Enzyme design. Structure first.
Site, PDB file in Angstrom:
ATOM      1  N   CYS A   1      17.081  21.880  -2.456  1.00  0.00           N
ATOM      2  CA  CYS A   1      18.446  22.311  -2.722  1.00  0.00           C
ATOM      3  C   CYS A   1      19.344  21.955  -1.547  1.00  0.00           C
ATOM      4  O   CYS A   1      19.669  22.787  -0.697  1.00  0.00           O
ATOM      5  CB  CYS A   1      18.483  23.790  -3.098  1.00  0.00           C
TER       6      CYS A   1
HETATM    7  C1  SRM Z   1      18.758  25.639  -5.266  1.00  0.00           C
HETATM    8  C2  SRM Z   1      19.795  25.359  -6.075  1.00  0.00           C
HETATM    9  N1  SRM Z   1      20.655  26.292  -6.526  1.00  0.00           N
HETATM   10 FE1  SRM Z   1      20.738  28.103  -5.962  1.00  0.00          FE
HETATM   11  N2  SRM Z   1      22.543  28.264  -6.557  1.00  0.00           N
HETATM   12  C3  SRM Z   1      23.445  29.214  -6.235  1.00  0.00           C
HETATM   13  C4  SRM Z   1      23.166  30.381  -5.641  1.00  0.00           C
HETATM   14  C5  SRM Z   1      21.819  30.986  -5.597  1.00  0.00           C
HETATM   15  C6  SRM Z   1      21.524  32.410  -5.273  1.00  0.00           C
HETATM   16  C7  SRM Z   1      22.452  33.605  -5.289  1.00  0.00           C
HETATM   17  C8  SRM Z   1      23.433  33.697  -4.146  1.00  0.00           C
HETATM   18  O1  SRM Z   1      23.457  32.809  -3.272  1.00  0.00           O
HETATM   19  O2  SRM Z   1      24.189  34.693  -4.121  1.00  0.00           O
HETATM   20  C9  SRM Z   1      20.041  32.425  -5.213  1.00  0.00           C
HETATM   21  C10 SRM Z   1      19.092  33.599  -5.054  1.00  0.00           C
HETATM   22  C11 SRM Z   1      19.094  34.190  -3.645  1.00  0.00           C
HETATM   23  C12 SRM Z   1      18.397  33.249  -2.687  1.00  0.00           C
HETATM   24  O3  SRM Z   1      19.075  32.646  -1.841  1.00  0.00           O
HETATM   25  O4  SRM Z   1      17.168  33.090  -2.771  1.00  0.00           O
HETATM   26  C13 SRM Z   1      19.695  30.989  -5.379  1.00  0.00           C
HETATM   27  C14 SRM Z   1      18.310  30.470  -5.377  1.00  0.00           C
HETATM   28  C15 SRM Z   1      17.904  29.068  -5.127  1.00  0.00           C
HETATM   29  C16 SRM Z   1      16.510  28.657  -4.814  1.00  0.00           C
HETATM   30  C17 SRM Z   1      15.330  29.539  -4.486  1.00  0.00           C
HETATM   31  C18 SRM Z   1      15.384  29.896  -3.005  1.00  0.00           C
HETATM   32  C19 SRM Z   1      14.143  30.687  -2.633  1.00  0.00           C
HETATM   33  O5  SRM Z   1      13.337  30.965  -3.545  1.00  0.00           O
HETATM   34  O6  SRM Z   1      13.958  31.032  -1.436  1.00  0.00           O
HETATM   35  C20 SRM Z   1      16.608  27.182  -4.754  1.00  0.00           C
HETATM   36  C21 SRM Z   1      15.462  26.228  -4.509  1.00  0.00           C
HETATM   37  C22 SRM Z   1      15.442  25.653  -3.117  1.00  0.00           C
HETATM   38  O7  SRM Z   1      16.046  26.251  -2.197  1.00  0.00           O
HETATM   39  O8  SRM Z   1      14.809  24.584  -2.952  1.00  0.00           O
HETATM   40  C23 SRM Z   1      18.018  26.927  -5.195  1.00  0.00           C
HETATM   41  N3  SRM Z   1      18.740  28.037  -5.353  1.00  0.00           N
HETATM   42  N4  SRM Z   1      20.751  30.165  -5.548  1.00  0.00           N
HETATM   43  C24 SRM Z   1      24.841  28.903  -6.721  1.00  0.00           C
HETATM   44  C25 SRM Z   1      25.625  28.289  -5.556  1.00  0.00           C
HETATM   45  C26 SRM Z   1      27.115  28.063  -5.836  1.00  0.00           C
HETATM   46  C27 SRM Z   1      27.958  28.420  -4.629  1.00  0.00           C
HETATM   47  O9  SRM Z   1      27.999  27.641  -3.653  1.00  0.00           O
HETATM   48  O10 SRM Z   1      28.601  29.491  -4.655  1.00  0.00           O
HETATM   49  C28 SRM Z   1      24.530  27.907  -7.837  1.00  0.00           C
HETATM   50  C29 SRM Z   1      25.481  26.709  -7.900  1.00  0.00           C
HETATM   51  C30 SRM Z   1      24.414  28.598  -9.195  1.00  0.00           C
HETATM   52  C31 SRM Z   1      25.758  28.863  -9.844  1.00  0.00           C
HETATM   53  O11 SRM Z   1      26.094  28.189 -10.845  1.00  0.00           O
HETATM   54  O12 SRM Z   1      26.481  29.769  -9.376  1.00  0.00           O
HETATM   55  C32 SRM Z   1      23.130  27.476  -7.464  1.00  0.00           C
HETATM   56  C33 SRM Z   1      22.520  26.452  -8.051  1.00  0.00           C
HETATM   57  C34 SRM Z   1      21.429  25.749  -7.380  1.00  0.00           C
HETATM   58  C35 SRM Z   1      21.136  24.302  -7.671  1.00  0.00           C
HETATM   59  C36 SRM Z   1      22.372  23.402  -7.613  1.00  0.00           C
HETATM   60  C37 SRM Z   1      23.208  23.529  -8.883  1.00  0.00           C
HETATM   61  C38 SRM Z   1      24.118  22.332  -9.061  1.00  0.00           C
HETATM   62  O13 SRM Z   1      23.778  21.470  -9.900  1.00  0.00           O
HETATM   63  O14 SRM Z   1      25.170  22.252  -8.381  1.00  0.00           O
HETATM   64  C39 SRM Z   1      20.153  23.957  -6.570  1.00  0.00           C
HETATM   65  C40 SRM Z   1      20.869  23.215  -5.444  1.00  0.00           C
HETATM   66  C41 SRM Z   1      19.030  23.147  -7.245  1.00  0.00           C
HETATM   67  C42 SRM Z   1      18.682  21.806  -6.599  1.00  0.00           C
HETATM   68  O15 SRM Z   1      19.575  20.964  -6.333  1.00  0.00           O
HETATM   69  O16 SRM Z   1      17.470  21.559  -6.376  1.00  0.00           O
HETATM   70  O1  LIG Z   2      20.566  26.551  -2.827  1.00  0.00           O
HETATM   71  S1  LIG Z   2      21.455  27.329  -3.788  1.00  0.00           S
HETATM   72  O2  LIG Z   2      21.776  28.452  -2.956  1.00  0.00           O
HETATM   73  O3  LIG Z   2      22.711  26.462  -3.697  1.00  0.00           O
END
Ligand code: SRM
Ligand SMILES: O=S([O-])[O-]
Ligand code: SRM
Ligand SMILES: C[C@@]1(CC(=O)O)/C2=C/C3N/C(=C\C4=N[C@@H](C[C@H]5N=C(/C=C(\N2)[C@H]1CCC(=O)O)[C@@H](CC(=O)O)[C@@H]5CCC(=O)O)C(CCC(=O)O)=C4CC(=O)O)[C@@](C)(CC(=O)O)[C@@H]3CCC(=O)O
Ligand code: SF4
Ligand code: SF4
Lengths: 436, 380, 103, 436, 380, 103
Positions: F102
């Site tokens: 991510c």
């Molecule tokens: C990666 C990807 N995420 Fe995302 N993510 C957003 C936010 C969250 C949150 C909630 C928060 O930040 O308040 C969580 C849960 C809390 C946490 O930090 O664990 C969250 C989880 C994760 C994980 C798991 C992390 C772990 O288990 O320790 C990953 C996998 C990794 O780190 O490899 C992961 N996320 N995420 C939110 C951000 C928008 C913002 O900037 O405000 C999202 C865009 C969701 C939304 O629509 O609100 C978001 C989505 C994503 C994926 C990108 C989505 C996109 O296409 O833009 C991403 C980056 C998956 C990837 O690229 O591999």
């Molecule tokens: O990795 S998610 O928090 O954008």
């Protein structure tokens, strides 16, 4: 030999019965030998034990060498060999083996039976015992290897009593006193214990398991043998129907004629019995009602904790549809952490000859004996191979009561035959709609 | 002067009796017990150590429970047999906490039985058969072998148990607590017995890694077993040179060792005991009954108390104090574990004045996290 | 510690060899009677051979179920050959380290 | 391009505002181009998105290629690149990057500010957004790589606004609305959030961590930003003294003049307000009392859960000695299971410029940045290296509130210095009193 | 038709502005807010979607909360800007659940603001600004990207959210539940958002192990990273021959794979998505507030519900039913998780009629044991 | 996919080489401008060399803290050399696989 024991001597004072004073009296009795017995082991055996113990107290370290492998022909366990680490200093305990003797379930004895046992131990033992071992066995504390076969012969031929278990086998089972002297007993725990003890004599005497395995039988949830904490296979009594309520009896409790908890709290002033505060409001399920004159119970929401019954044993009784629950995997910490029994079967018939219970045991052994790792307790096999596997080998369908709470993690395994198309997929097919 | 029992060493398997088990459970039942088996209606605790059971027939049985050292002579057993013959028709019982019970079928026998029992003493002055162990008090201590017979302990059993019972004796003979308090003791983390599920548990602990007898490692032990016996994977096979001789031995990562002593259980070349290092921990709050709350494991509240034979003053003082504050604070029927949990462990520490050290915070694997505080709900 | 037919054997209180390397076919003859055995049959030797092979190859004694499976001898059969069992009997006679843990 | 969207069309019906209808309107607006804009990306961009989405709905599988690495010079994150897996079928979204824009804490905007932002996105973007991302960022959904530097320039020079965070860095911090509009606020959560956001601009824009790290600020335990569940470093407001009780105000609640929970349950008939049943008996600490006329609180036993305050906001108020608690390690499941923040500091001063808080953050980073494993969240480092290690690096003494319960297992580590003689012992010394 | 913004690609670092962060939080405060900052006394929920805050000065601020699809056009933003200019002095706010709030300082403006908002609709007929999301009801759904932008989902986000909100809409506009019910959704186990801590969580899951693009494994991925990314250690490096060519690739132990899809996140050569295999699980009982009980994680109660675009009927039907039985049974202020725990999860299953399958029993590591039932305390 | 000075390079939409083996010193010259670099100094080469050595030896890109420690270049310095950072900049120019996760 005679040693000075200034430290141990201090344990002769105080109210509580002193093991030191008792060991000394046995030492004195042997020295006097009023029966003119030809002691098979050193007469001073008990004195030498006190000598070693004083030394250990001085240095703050055990003086028994590591392990020991002694036994009786035909058996793989039952005798715990032990050798003093300073055999010349304390020759009386150079060999200090312990013999585990099978006890009656609930430990009801006759003075005659015990006397015969003592007579045997007097001549071929140290005169010291443990009544009883934590597993339930009668313990004959201290003898020499040449006496082992002699004692066994006398035990089996004269006392008509066998040895208990030790090693990676089925250990000696034990039960609460059950129906013998308790109004709470949901099934004959003593008979189940004796029955299964006899059923599995081979597994008990000849270790064939990956590790040790224990059975314990409690006739109700109160757990007087602590089967949920100290047996791999715990059988706890219960009922399926309603708690019996004696209306006049409850009024008598409310009136103060009957003592709360049978007078278990008579040493302090807790005030007058308050049925609402003491029982209704203490019910974990909050399934009880007291309208000022009558007490009612929503039985379908009762978790049968026993509280109301323990509190008003004269007014409230266990149901008529009795049986037991089977819980599995309790064990001490080593290796992966302490475990208590996890509910496997919520309700099983518990009447002689207890075939339903035996069937579960055997299905568990069939699996664990083959799949369990070396020195792996059932509880740990459950953790490693999963509760789902245990259910599968025992042929028990998953039920909400098998769990205190559902899983939090989403790391769910699915059976291939349940997912459309199985797991064999072709990447080139996928690559057709999803280009790199 | 050898005395054969009839056993023929020349023909060991001749006349060999096996698989007979114990005497059937009901064989030595007192007549009133056998007749009223499974037909009891209710019971009463007439006083500390005395019970009465009433059967559907109207028949009554009176029970007198008496303390015992567990480890006992055949001389003492014989004395109890005499007492049993005198008042109980030759019948007696042992409990699951190793107390002894004498039963009679009438009040007059009950009165004579008790007066007799209460009068007997050992030459040294201790009570031979103190009556008690019933209801909301402190009964016998479930314990182990200690320095009397085991090779893996880190403390004694019989000694500390006597020292503790002397200190809480009044509670063995009275029922003044909010609920029964169970005290158990084990000489090592193998926790033989019930320490891990008792209101108060005492367990012997080590504070130093094992020593390695390199000359005997590969001779006396099965090295792979020792490697597989460590909960923290601190044990590993290694090679060491000794007097122009290389040997297959063991290496222990001291920083990963928590002195459980399990490798020594498996390998005699890994001795661990230490006079000054060894001590005891105190765990509280466990329970096996399903009454009100589900069963609980006891929790470590005192990381270390040194061994002080023969009376273990620090141990006993601390145990007595814990019972005192629990008794002064818990609700009726409230087990020590239920009380501590209801008020919050931080209030248990402040009320008891026990020091909270870094040792008390669980650090063992993934489950450790769940013992931490994921909430702002806490008392200052 | 113990002598037999001119051979000296270093042993423990339990009669177990302190060193697998100190083992020889004569040790078997010296120990047998103490283990309720008069004649060492081929079935005895088969069990002894297996334990030795397994130990030399794995550094551990095989589990009972493994001994039975590889040997073809069910537990009952094993006890008929070695009265004191696979541990106290066969392991001792085979020269393997004494069984440890809560026996 | 224009595609058929029979499935998506069904999501235009119903009451809830439809994303489909909104995307269609933006598509229609671009096609009309009433402003005569020279669109920097395909005019039909939004229509192509709908085209791809319909396809995904048909096949039940995503149509975005794996990952994507785009950005803006000087920064290591802030832009989430994305490429359609069928670029020739849907050229409008061949490049569909997302830009994360730093938002004001609490998200208070002016119509003018938003207008300028939209103007920027109109010309160089797809016209679609996310208000807001789960982390708090303004999300500009869909553009092409050549536009990235152009947007950044306009954002920094015209909008005076930076990019948000992405990758293994300090992500965009967020807070509850705090003092801006809530009587429960114990500290300025918005100011703390903005202050720390500015303090750590470098750590946010240029990933230097083993993995991602988040800050979230809640001005009270109600957790309106969910910092305890969604931030590695959670700052939750609280008070040290007594809850303020307005005696007349409580009578007014009891009298029925004031609505319970500010009328949060007006949609159903819950009967008349019962202060005893609704608040006194619901207090987890059971530290409240209602004598029929006056309500009292044993503050020393209050766990500050907020229940009484949430229920009678007019009568009960937070204390005057305000600050916050710091909890650490919350994270989603991957890899070792979901975690919520574990209490690290029970009470810390929470006033600008918030140096006390910063000090903790920095002591944590110093440790985790060096000891944390690749892709290891702080919560997992805590599990692996221990809560004790975290306390040590932050220089915080162990306190009973650091634990919900003491450990059950006896696998206790001791510091060598704490133990008489240390760990270096000689077997030959031991062998003197304990022969082999 | 390139149009430069003044940015010089030839001189990228020229005139580069960095590290400015966002606009200071208080910059766009409404005047009433700025003046009364930190001086609020109490508040009232005048009706669903409407709040009133009273400051120490006596000043009042009225808030109108309105639903929003989160994914929105600049056209929609502009419309809200128009509305803000008309009634709110050009000021507006977005919540932590992505709802929009419009604030005024007088009752007349409040009346006109609401009537206007309630009248606006999209051409398709859906409400542009439905008022609500306050008190004990169902507010906005915290959700993710789904098929709109992410490469790792196993389901969509926007679609299912719209389908759910339509089904529970009445609860967005009323406050009839025992306590607020939070619904969150995530497209994969990464659980971006709040699904793991919500009253009701929906998460996309896979039911098949990943496919392996052997030709690209060693080219596109850092194999050791993929190996370290598996929670069950099912991933291992391997060598495979292909057309007279041996390659460094990956091997997956299917029996140890639980389809988390994390290896794909790390390695593009491990695609996992599947139309028929993919679905959703439902988790319930989580909460983030410290009110009454400590925060809770949501628990898996439905192992699998297939994807059914575009309305996901099974998903929505099930969610509505869960809310129904919770609402009919829970006490006032009682969150769904508190209720389920109080009555016992077995009573939650029987009342809801949800099937209890083997999937629901935790089998992940040592913590799994603690989720099982170590007590006889249970309802039939 | 992309041609430079008469030679061809197979690349992805992000401009990353599909194969580490397809890398050559000329790839660096072709990519630099796109990464805000005009001249490849010795400090640039040092960073590029390290990434390549680490990758060949470990099969993974080094962590940022490892790059800094071995290279001696603090993060600030790294960004001065490679404007888009160690991932999009140095890794791309060094020919390592595209960063995943991510990001
Ligand atoms: C990666 C990807 N995420 Fe995302 N993510 C957003 C936010 C969250 C949150 C909630 C928060 O930040 O308040 C969580 C849960 C809390 C946490 O930090 O664990 C969250 C989880 C994760 C994980 C798991 C992390 C772990 O288990 O320790 C990953 C996998 C990794 O780190 O490899 C992961 N996320 N995420 C939110 C951000 C928008 C913002 O900037 O405000 C999202 C865009 C969701 C939304 O629509 O609100 C978001 C989505 C994503 C994926 C990108 C989505 C996109 O296409 O833009 C991403 C980056 C998956 C990837 O690229 O591999
Ligand atoms: O990795 S998610 O928090 O954008
Ligand atoms: C080994 C040794 N034990 Fe023992 N042990 C007795 C009983 C218990 C019980 C309680 C019960 O059976 O009701 C437990 C806890 C429940 C459980 O089974 O886990 C218990 C624990 C253990 C362990 C740990 C097992 C595990 O972690 O999974 C071991 C280590 C191991 O297996 O390698 C262990 N025990 N034990 C009781 C038996 C008497 C009887 O037959 O009734 C004791 C004699 C204690 C007592 O005084 O009542 C007893 C003691 C022992 C050690 C032998 C003592 C002796 O010198 O005779 C022994 C065999 C240590 C050893 O030889 O290595
Ligand atoms: C003699 C015993 C059985 C045996 O030998 O087979 C025996 C007899 C009786 N038990 C009865 C009541 C119930 N028992 C306990 C449970 C505990 N009792 C066991 C021990 C024994 N019970 C043996 C004696 C041990 C000893 O010497 O003292 C434990 C095993 C152990 O400690 O290791 C065990 C688990 C402890 C735990 O939870 O952690 C319990 C729940 C308590 C609570 O939660 O509040 C009550 C409910 C209550 O008190 O109202 C009576 C009333 C049953 C009856 O006749 O109607 C009998 C008379 C009781 C008495 O005398 O006050
Ligand atoms: S477990 Fe129940 S039935 Fe057995 S003695 Fe104890 S109280 Fe009675
Ligand atoms: S967290 Fe507390 S202070 Fe902040 S907005 Fe929510 S209720 Fe108010």
């Amino acid at each position: 030999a005679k040693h000075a024991t200034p430290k141990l001597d201090q344990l002769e004072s105080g109210p509580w019965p002193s093991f030191v004073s008792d060991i000394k009296q046995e030492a004195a009795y042997r020295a006097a030998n009023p029966k003119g017995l030809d002691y098979q082991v050193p007469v001073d055996c008990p004195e030498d034990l006190l000598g070693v113990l004083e030394l250990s107290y001085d240095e703050g370290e055990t003086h028994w060498k590591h392990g020991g492998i002694v036994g009786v022909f035909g058996y793989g366990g039952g005798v715990i060999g032990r050798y003093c680490d300073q055999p010349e200093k304390f020759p009386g305990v150079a060999h200090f083996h312990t013999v585990r003797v099978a006890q009656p379930s609930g430990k009801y004895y006759s003075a005659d039976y015990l006397r015969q046992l003592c007579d045997i131990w007097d001549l071929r033992g140290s005169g010291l015992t443990n009544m009883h071992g934590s597993t339930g066995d009668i313990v004959l504390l201290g003898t020499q290897t040449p006496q082992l076969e002699e004692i066994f012969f006398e035990l089996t031929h004269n006392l008509n009593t066998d040895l208990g278990g030790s090693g990676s086998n089925l250990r000696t089972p034990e039960s609460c006193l059950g129906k013998s002297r308790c109004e709470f007993a949901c099934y004959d725990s003593q008979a189940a214990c004796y029955e299964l003890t006899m059923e599995y004599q081979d597994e008990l005497h000849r270790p064939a398991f990956p590790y040790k395995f224990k059975f314990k039988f409690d006739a109700c949830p109160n757990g007087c043998v602590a089967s949920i904490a100290r047996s791999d296979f715990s059988v706890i009594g219960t009922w399926k129907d309603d708690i019996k309520i004696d209306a006049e009896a409850v009024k008598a409790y409310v009136a103060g004629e009957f003592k709360p908890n049978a007078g278990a709290h008579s040493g302090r002033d807790w005030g007058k019995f308050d049925i609402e505060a003491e029982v209704v409001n203490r019910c974990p399920s909050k399934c009880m009602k007291w309208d000022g004159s009558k007490l009612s119970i929503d039985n379908k929401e009762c978790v049968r904790c026993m509280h109301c019954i323990n509190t008003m044993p004269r007014a409230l009784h266990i149901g008529d549809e009795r049986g037991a629950s089977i819980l599995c995997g309790a064990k001490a910490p080593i290796l992966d952490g302490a475990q208590m029994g996890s509910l496997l079967v919520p309700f099983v018939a518990a009447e002689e000859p207890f075939d339903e219970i035996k069937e579960v045991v055997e299905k568990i052994w069939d699996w664990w004996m083959e799949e369990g790792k070396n020195r792996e307790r059932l509880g740990e096999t459950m953790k490693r191979l999963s509760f789902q596997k245990l259910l599968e080998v025992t042929e028990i369908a998953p039920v909400p009561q098998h769990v205190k709470e559902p899983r939090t993690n989403p790391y769910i395994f699915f059976k291939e035959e349940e997912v459309p198309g199985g797991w064999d997929r072709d990447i080139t097919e996928y690559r057709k709609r999803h280009l790199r | 002067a050898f005395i054969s029992s009839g056993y023929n060493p020349e023909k060991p398997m001749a006349n060999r009796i096996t698989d007979i088990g114990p005497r059937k459970f009901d064989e030595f039942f007192p007549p009133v017990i056998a007749k009223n088996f499974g037909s009891w209606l209710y019971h009463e605790i007439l006083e500390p150590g005395v019970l009465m059971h009433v059967a559907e027939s109207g028949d009554k049985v009176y029970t007198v429970r008496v303390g015992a050292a567990r480890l006992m002579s055949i001389t003492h057993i014989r004395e109890m047999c005499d007492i049993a013959d005198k008042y109980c028709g030759g019948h007696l019982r042992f409990t699951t906490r190793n107390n002894v019970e004498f039963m009679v079928a009438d009040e007059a026998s009950l009165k004579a039985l008790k007066e007799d029992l209460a009068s007997r003493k050992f030459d040294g002055g201790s009570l031979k058969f103190p009556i008690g162990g019933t209801g909301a008090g402190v009964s016998n201590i479930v314990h182990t072998q200690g320095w009397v017979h085991c090779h893996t302990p880190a403390t004694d059993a019989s000694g500390p148990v006597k020292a503790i019972m002397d200190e809480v004796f009044e509670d063995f003979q009275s029922m003044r607590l909010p609920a029964p308090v169970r005290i158990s003791l084990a000489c090592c983390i193998n926790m033989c017995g019930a320490v891990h599920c008792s209101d108060i548990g005492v367990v012997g602990i080590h504070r130093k890694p094992p020593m390695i007898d390199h000359e005997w490692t590969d001779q006396l032990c099965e090295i792979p077993l020792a490697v597989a016996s460590c909960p923290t994977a601190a044990v590993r096979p290694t090679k060491l040179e000794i007097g122009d001789k290389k040997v297959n031995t063991i290496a222990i990562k001291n920083e990963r060792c928590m002195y459980c002593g399990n490798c020594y259980t498996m390998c005699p070349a890994l001795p661990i005991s230490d006079g000054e290092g060894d001590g005891v921990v105190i765990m509280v709050g466990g329970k096996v009954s399903n009454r009100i709350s589900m069963p609980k494991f006891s929790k470590v509240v005192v990381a270390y108390i040194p061994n002080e034979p023969p009376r273990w003053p620090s141990l006993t003082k601390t145990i007595k104090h814990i019972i005192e504050v629990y008794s002064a604070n818990a609700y009726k029927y409230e087990r020590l574990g239920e009380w501590a949990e209801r008020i919050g462990w931080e209030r248990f520490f402040s009320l008891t004045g026990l020091e909270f050290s870094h040792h008390l915070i669980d650090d063992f694997r993934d489950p450790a996290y769940y013992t931490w505080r994921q909430s702002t709900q806490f008392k200052f | 510690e113990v002598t037999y037919k001119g051979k000296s054997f270093e042993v423990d209180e339990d009669g177990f060899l302190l060193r697998f390397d100190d083992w020889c076919p004569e040790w078997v003859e010296y120990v047998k009677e103490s283990e309720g055995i008069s004649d060492i049959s081929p079935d005895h030797q088969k069990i002894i051979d297996f334990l030795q092979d397994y130990y030399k190859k794995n550094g551990i004694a095989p589990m009972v179920r493994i001994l039975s499976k590889n040997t073809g001898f069910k537990l009952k059969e094993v006890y008929e050959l070695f009265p004191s069992g696979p541990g106290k009997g066969a392991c001792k006679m085979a020269g393997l380290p004494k069984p440890t843990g809560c026996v």
